[PDB]
Amino acid sequence: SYEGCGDLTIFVAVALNKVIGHKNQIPWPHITHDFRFLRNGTTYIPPEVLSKNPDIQNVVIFGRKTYESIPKASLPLKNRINVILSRTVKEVPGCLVYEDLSTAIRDLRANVPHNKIFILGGSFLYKEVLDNGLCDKIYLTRLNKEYPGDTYFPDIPDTFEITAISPTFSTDFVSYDFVIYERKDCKPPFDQLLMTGTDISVPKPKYVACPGVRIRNHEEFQYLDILADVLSHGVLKPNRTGTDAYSKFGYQMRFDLSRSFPLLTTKKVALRSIIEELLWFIKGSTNGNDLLAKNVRIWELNGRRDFLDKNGFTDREEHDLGPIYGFQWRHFGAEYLDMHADYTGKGIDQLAEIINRIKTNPNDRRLIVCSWNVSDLKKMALPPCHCFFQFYVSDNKLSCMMHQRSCDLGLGVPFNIASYSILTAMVAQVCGLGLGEFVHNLADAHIYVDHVDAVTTQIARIPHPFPRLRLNPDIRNIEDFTIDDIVVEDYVSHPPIPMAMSA
Amino acid sequence: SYEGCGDLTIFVAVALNKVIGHKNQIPWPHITHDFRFLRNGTTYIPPEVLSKNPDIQNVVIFGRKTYESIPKASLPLKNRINVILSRTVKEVPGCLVYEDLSTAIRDLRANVPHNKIFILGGSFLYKEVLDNGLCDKIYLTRLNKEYPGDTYFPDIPDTFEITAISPTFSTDFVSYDFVIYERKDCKPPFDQLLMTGTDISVPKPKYVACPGVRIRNHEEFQYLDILADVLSHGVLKPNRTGTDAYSKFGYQMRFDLSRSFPLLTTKKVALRSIIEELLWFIKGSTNGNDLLAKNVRIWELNGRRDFLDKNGFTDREEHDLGPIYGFQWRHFGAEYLDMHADYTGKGIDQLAEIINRIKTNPNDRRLIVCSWNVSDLKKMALPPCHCFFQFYVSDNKLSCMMHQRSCDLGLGVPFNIASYSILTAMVAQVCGLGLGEFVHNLADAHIYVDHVDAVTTQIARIPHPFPRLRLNPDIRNIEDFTIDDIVVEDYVSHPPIPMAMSA
Ligand SMILES: NC(=O)c1ccc[n+]([C@@H]2O[C@H](COP(=O)([O-])OP(=O)(O)OC[C@H]3O[C@@H](n4cnc5c(N)ncnc54)[C@H](OP(=O)(O)O)[C@@H]3O)[C@@H](O)[C@H]2O)c1
Ligand SMILES: NC(=O)c1ccc[n+]([C@@H]2O[C@H](COP(=O)([O-])OP(=O)(O)OC[C@H]3O[C@@H](n4cnc5c(N)ncnc54)[C@H](OP(=O)(O)O)[C@@H]3O)[C@@H](O)[C@H]2O)c1
Ligand SMILES: Nc1nc(=O)c2c(CCc3ccc(C(=O)N[C@@H](CCC(=O)O)C(=O)O)cc3)c[nH]c2[nH]1
Ligand SMILES: Nc1nc(=O)c2c(CCc3ccc(C(=O)N[C@@H](CCC(=O)O)C(=O)O)cc3)c[nH]c2[nH]1
Ligand SMILES: Nc1nc(=O)c2c(CCc3ccc(C(=O)N[C@@H](CCC(=O)O)C(=O)O)cc3)c[nH]c2[nH]1
Ligand SMILES: Nc1nc(=O)c2c(CCc3ccc(C(=O)N[C@@H](CCC(=O)O)C(=O)O)cc3)c[nH]c2[nH]1
Ligand SMILES: O=c1ccn([C@H]2C[C@H](O)[C@@H](COP(=O)(O)O)O2)c(=O)[nH]1
Ligand SMILES: O=c1ccn([C@H]2C[C@H](O)[C@@H](COP(=O)(O)O)O2)c(=O)[nH]1
Numbered sequence A, B: 001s002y003e004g005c006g007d008l009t010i011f012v013a014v015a016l017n018k019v020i021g022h023k024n025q026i027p028w029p030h031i032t033h034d035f036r037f038l039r040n041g042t043t044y045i046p047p048e049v050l051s052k053n054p055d056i057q058n059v060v061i062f063g064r065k066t067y068e069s070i071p072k073a074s075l076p077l078k079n080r081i082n083v084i085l086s087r088t089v090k091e092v093p094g095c096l097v098y099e100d101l102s103t104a105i106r107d108l109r110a111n112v113p114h115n116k117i118f119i120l121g122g123s124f125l126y127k128e129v130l131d132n133g134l135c136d137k138i139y140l141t142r143l144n145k146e147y148p149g150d151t152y153f154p155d156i157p158d159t160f161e162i163t164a165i166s167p168t169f170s171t172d173f174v175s176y177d178f179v180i181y182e183r184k185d186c187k188p189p190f191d192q193l194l195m196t197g198t199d200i201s202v203p204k205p206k207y208v209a210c211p212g213v214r215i216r217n218h219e220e221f222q223y224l225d226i227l228a229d230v231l232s233h234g235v236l237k238p239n240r241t242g243t244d245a246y247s248k249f250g251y252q253m254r255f256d257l258s259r260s261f262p263l264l265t266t267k268k269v270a271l272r273s274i275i276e277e278l279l280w281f282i283k284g285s286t287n288g289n290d291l292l293a294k295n296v297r298i299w300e301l302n303g304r305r306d307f308l309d310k311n312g313f314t315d316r317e318e319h320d321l322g323p324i325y326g327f328q329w330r331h332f333g334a335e336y337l338d339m340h341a342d343y344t345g346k347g348i349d350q351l352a353e354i355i356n357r358i359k360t361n362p363n364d365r366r367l368i369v370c371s372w373n374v375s376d377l378k379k380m381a382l383p384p385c386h387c388f389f390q391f392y393v394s395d396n397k398l399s400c401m402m403h404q405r406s407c408d409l410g411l412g413v414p415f416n417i418a419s420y421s422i423l424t425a426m427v428a429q430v431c432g433l434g435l436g437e438f439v440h441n442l443a444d445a446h447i448y449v450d451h452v453d454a455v456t457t458q459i460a461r462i463p464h465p466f467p468r469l470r471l472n473p474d475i476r477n478i479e480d481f482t483i484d485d486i487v488v489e490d491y492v493s494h495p496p497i498p499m500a501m502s503a
Helices: A032-043 A047-052 A064-068 A101-111 A123-131 A190-194 A220-233 A271-282 A305-310 A325-331 A350-360 A374-379 A412-430 A449-459 B032-043 B047-052 B064-068 B101-111 B123-131 B190-194 B220-233 B271-282 B305-310 B325-331 B350-360 B412-430 B449-459
Strands: A008-014 A019-021 A059-063 A081-085 A095-098 A117-119 A135-143 A160-165 A175-183 A235-237 A245-256 A368-370 A386-394 A397-408 A434-448 A468-471 A486-489 B008-014 B019-021 B059-063 B081-085 B096-098 B117-119 B135-143 B160-165 B175-183 B235-237 B245-256 B368-370 B386-394 B397-408 B434-448 B468-471 B486-489
Touching (some): A008 A123, A032 B190, A059 A064, A059 A101, A064 A081, A081 A101, A101 A117, A101 A123, A190 B032, A220 A449, A245 A412, A245 A449, A245 B397, A245 B434, A271 A325, A271 A412, A325 A350, A350 A368, A350 A412, A386 A412, A386 B245, A386 B434, A397 A412, A397 B245, A397 B434, A412 A434, A412 A468, A434 A449, A434 B245, A434 B386, B008 B019, B008 B032, B008 B123, B059 B064, B059 B101, B059 B123, B081 B101, B096 B101, B101 B117, B101 B123, B220 B245, B220 B434, B220 B449, B245 B412, B271 B325, B271 B412, B325 B350, B350 B386, B350 B412, B386 B412, B386 B434, B397 B412, B412 B434, B434 B449
Parallel strands (some): A008 A117, A059 A117, A081 A095, B008 B117, B008 B135, B059 B117, B081 B096
Antiparallel strands (some): A135 A175, A160 A175, A235 A245, B160 B175, B235 B245, B245 B434, B368 B386
16 A cells, blocks of 8 residues: 555654644744754755756655645745645645645656655644654654644654754744654764774773764763763772762863753753752852752751761851852952851952953953862862853853862762853853853762662663753843742753762 | 786884884884784774675785794784795795785785785885885884884885874883875765754864874874864954964863873974973972073063063062962962062962872862962962862872863963873872873963964974873972983974964
């Protein structure tokens, strides 16, 4: 029945609730970037094929209803053979018309010189294509938001897997990315091996994040790869906590903050806790009760009585963490008494200083906030892990680099990535700047023994498109941001993964 | 004469003075790594070819004398067809013998089933092969030392170019790498382009280091690639000095210090100046005269009367640079008076504390020397560029990571790379540790406009194998190293490239 009708390639854009159409129209506001991706995907002809037949084109196939879903401004689709399937219309300007798919494909491959056939919907057509195994490859644009609709993309069969994932992009109404699914059952020159000067037979690593994904452009892969690399090649070392960890040294990640917000999607990350922690840093607090009071418990264990006493801090009030981040950001050099003291106008307000300098002298090469106050180290419950960051301006875009001396990959690193991304966005906004990159340096990167099963599970999870960040555009000063001013939209994630903190 | 005798592939190992042989023996102590490279290169059969004939072997061709040059025990060379050329010997146990090359190649390619033919010398044979254009590819082990000898490798014709370079390796007696030359005249799927989500036709970068080199495993490539990247994509910005610079933010380089010493070879680097400056940091000096007195002038322009005056240091004695590196390394938190004050027992001796912590608690995750003393910045003639570094120990190897806020890629970066490599080796030695990696994080990395021609010239230069470092093993304390205790052996470099410093 469908003899000769296979290897049909689908292009579709699909909302989170699988909706693809609403009142015969696209359900979301137009994403022209998606239109260009579709155009580029469906027009491509390999160089070899094109030099032999230079007039050769691909085919696009639609139901009639989808065909009207398109303007005249862009119709019939330029440089491709347009084909419409329909039992009620006989003729359409610019197109070939067939009564059914099996006739169409047969006629096409027998009688119409073309390169590749693409399937552009709608549901009727997609459903026929998938129920009958006629598709070997899907180009799918994933939108991280639900839209009202009445037309849906069918579930993709378990016979398919994701093999490519673009970077996450965003408009101001949705975050999205592009992926490729391929049917599983049809999905290294020697000099390269020799010229390493090392073993020509190098056994593949023990741990590989998402082995089936061959094009790995989602920024989350940086974090997943590092996890895989420390599990594969990390050395188990004792450490101060008394819970051992597999450790490796030296990594650099970067995130394009103009495109998306790098809140990990491979587990549900406690965003509320990250935001309260940052606002806590900004206002200069070193009182752990300020976080507890807001139902954030991430700093509880390093301020507990037994932890303080274990480390010689026998005169320290519980949850007085000492002159850590908040104190150094706002009062570097001031004498730390305790977490209740008035430090107003005492020490150096690095945070204020550097924001003002970004405004007045963007090309300054010393835009640094440093929490590694060597004189204060002995007073600290836990010396800063993210101990140093530096801003940078070019082309009216702010970037930030942070140095992290000690990186708990399971627990803290995901917090750190998201925290500095927000800080950069805040700083960019109060300075009237666009968004560049967050560059994250890992020095001692490790995975605690009791997180191994957690992270093994995690790195097998396919990333969702990252979410996007919106700050209240009215906030003019970094000290004014409240939690309601900091909104992460379109966060799609896998389930939370419990991991215990080693104090 | 030589019809059907082309595409013969050479393997040779060559001393810096082109010597390959001495008294019919190898002129250097044996490098078993080189033998292993040779054996792997000459025994490889492509998997496709091997399945069709699972007994197929390659050919190795020698002169009589070169055969006589290998132990009778290691011979005939295993898993290959051994061929000897000779006019004075007719039969050799388990080898083929020919009277001349042309006959040999013809007989072999017509009558002896085999995969690929290799040429293993000596000079008579290499010369005949090169003089007659019979070679399309050369596997060449470069040694950075001259050896006595009486047999030489001919000059390689300018019809060849280097297309592959291994990482630099070393024994205790020589620095070396592997390279491939290929004859010039005969030397990515669309999904990869589409799945970036950006412009599918990418204008190739304007600058590329060593475009001819396809396998780029020499660590110097990190530095050359970064030069090429900043030239290509960096933004022209003004800065403190009044000479503009192309600038790009965020890189990470690493150097395996157990293998070689990363003193750049694409220009002759002023190593003596690097050592004196480091010894100057170590002893804690902030007096620029201490450097001038050793005929090192790198800090002179930043301590000069006019520079001090124009930065408001009108009361500062000339070449009193203020509480910069030496002071922070040894006395962080002491009150800086001037460069003549006695600071003995004042402030925190970070350098001493970290070296002692490496000895007593190698798994500590706070092994940091921080020169970004925020309290002292306003006193400094030039706030530290390499402002923060951190050590790490695993598998009995010391690694180091440095954060450089501002990176004069033309002048200072080459100094910083070698400086921290020496410092790491020194610290490793006094703590009885082996050598791991130096990891170099660059924040604002830039190229001054007046260095563009210089660096454009530099990035087309093919790197030599890096040199190696030897410290005097008697030195037990970091303060005891003197210039004569720190020896760089086997430094081979292209000419110096003049570059002017912007103050
Ligand atoms: N977001 C996306 O990626 C995407 C992609 C495509 C479409 N859409 C949206 O989806 C909607 C259109 O889809 P839809 O499911 O409502 O309609 P559709 O599938 O485009 O068209 C339905 C009609 O096409 C004809 N047809 C389809 N398969 C046929 C076959 N095998 N043989 C004969 N005729 C066939 C029949 O028309 P007759 O009445 O002539 O028999 C059928 O009633 C629009 O809202 C559009 O914007 C979205
Ligand atoms: N480091 C390296 O990569 C390397 C590589 C190879 C060799 N080597 C060194 O080089 C030295 C040996 O080389 P070498 O140049 O002295 O000698 P060689 O070229 O190995 O052999 C000399 C003899 O080979 C014969 N021969 C070469 N080409 C011939 C041709 N076309 N037709 C007939 N006979 C031919 C002659 O034969 P008869 O005299 O027998 O008639 C000649 O006297 C040794 O010291 C060895 O260790 C070093
Ligand atoms: N990924 C994806 N997104 C979609 O919206 C979609 C559709 C919806 C129908 C549709 C088809 C073409 C264009 C259309 O206008 N196409 C123009 C693009 C305009 C341009 O960028 O120049 C074209 O030339 O293809 C607009 C809408 C089917 N398959 C799709 N797949
Ligand atoms: N060993 C160690 N690792 C660290 O990263 C760390 C920190 C960084 C802050 C931190 C601490 C705990 C959690 C954390 O527990 N997060 C959990 C729960 C989050 C929540 O429910 O709010 C998580 O699953 O992400 C997340 C972040 C302080 N002390 C630490 N000590
Ligand atoms: N790069 C290079 N280095 C050289 O020394 C060399 C030579 C010198 C002659 C020569 C040939 C083979 C071996 C020899 O013993 N080969 C053994 C090595 C055994 C092993 O290490 O396992 C082999 O099996 O090839 C040792 C010396 C020719 N071409 C060369 N090219
Ligand atoms: N703009 C700027 N860039 C810097 O890197 C820097 C420094 C770092 C130290 C430094 C200064 C000059 C040279 C240097 O001049 N090197 C020359 C000559 C070396 C010699 O012969 O001693 C070189 O060609 O490498 C190399 C290193 C202080 N102030 C600076 N200001
Ligand atoms: O913001 C933070 C703070 C701490 N840590 C981690 C690193 C270590 O796992 C632990 C601190 O222990 P030390 O490195 O100080 O020993 O907490 C983070 O990952 N991010
Ligand atoms: O060890 C050093 C010291 C300085 N610089 C460079 C960076 C800048 O080009 C210049 C210092 O100027 P500012 O970044 O402070 O403006 O010196 C280095 O590259 N390495």
